[PDB]
Amino acid sequence: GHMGAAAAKKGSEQESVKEFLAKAKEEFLKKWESPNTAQLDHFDRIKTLGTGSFGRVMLVKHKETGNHYAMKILDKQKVVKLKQIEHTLNEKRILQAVNFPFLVKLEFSFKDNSNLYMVMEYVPGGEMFSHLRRIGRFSEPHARFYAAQIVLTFEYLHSLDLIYRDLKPENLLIDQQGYIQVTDFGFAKRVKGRTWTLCGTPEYLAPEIILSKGYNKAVDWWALGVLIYEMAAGYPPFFADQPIQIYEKIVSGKVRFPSHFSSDLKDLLRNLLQVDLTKRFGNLKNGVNDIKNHKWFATTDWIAIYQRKVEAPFIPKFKGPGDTSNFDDYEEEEIRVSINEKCGKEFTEF
Amino acid sequence: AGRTGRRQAIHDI
Ligand SMILES: NC(=[NH2+])c1ccc(C(F)(F)F)cc1
């Protein structure tokens, strides 16, 4: 066979994974079942680090301790649509319950008359997105180092019946050791089988989402294929100016690869970017092991990645606590808190 | 030709 000895080690390794995930699910459930840890005036606001339709993320400094954090601020009056609301509750509850080396750590959450707040660990190395766009593309070993962390993170999340649903370089921060921190759980959801919301980012949507089919955690493995392609090529596989054109390309079932992609890489991506769910890697009898044991990952020491023992390909420069040099600049708008509570009943659970 | 800037997610397409 392909493995000689090496097969016994891999099997024992797989059994240890099971053991780890069983303990991880016990810890998750304790926090999921039995979960206002601060207020706004406990923080100095320093700089906007990112913006979206519903609010912004700011670097803040805790007045008492002097620790720096990333504060996600959501305007309750922009979180209007039904699924926008449910998703905000998913995000908070999931983040407070998970624990994994490549997932950002939530520190505080609270709300006031106008906004919802989630205060998480600050990751000063910046978004993968901006490093990727600056250099163009990552070499295959570099992309593989990041991909391995996502594989392990999705193995963890899926074992807790959590689907992530917004994988992309914008959501992956680089920490001071050069490892990944997944940092936005706004589309994550606990799903025991299928779910039906039409949501995500166009370039990363699995075909079954676009086709309004009930779908499962395999959409994350499709998105992993998009991510690895984008990291190694510098652009994603389904690439067009308008969302409707992107959707047509995704559903077609056709992917073209750069001539510099290794044959091992193309093989992996053809099995991830597989429209047929009975054939998509991650969704088969052997689950995530079809991915972890693929030839493209032959050099990957999965345990060593988890334990953060592998030397990173890139270490971001940091000038000191609070440094924002690895982030882009954004327009700064004052945080105004209304005198009257807004949307109290719709966010009573937050 | 495609989108090169940051991409916004959609909560309900
Ligand atoms: N350090 C952080 N946890 C953090 C920083 C920036 C963003 C952004 F990508 F939205 F900009 C999100 C989270």
Automatic annotation (TrEMBL), chain B:
Superkingdom of origin: Eukaryota
Site feature (Important for inhibition) residues: 3, 6-7
Task performed by this protein: Extremely potent competitive inhibitor of cAMP-dependent protein kinase activity, this protein interacts with the catalytic subunit of the enzyme after the cAMP-induced dissociation of its regulatory chains.
Family: Belongs to the PKI family.
Protein name (record): cAMP-dependent protein kinase inhibitor
Gene: Pkia
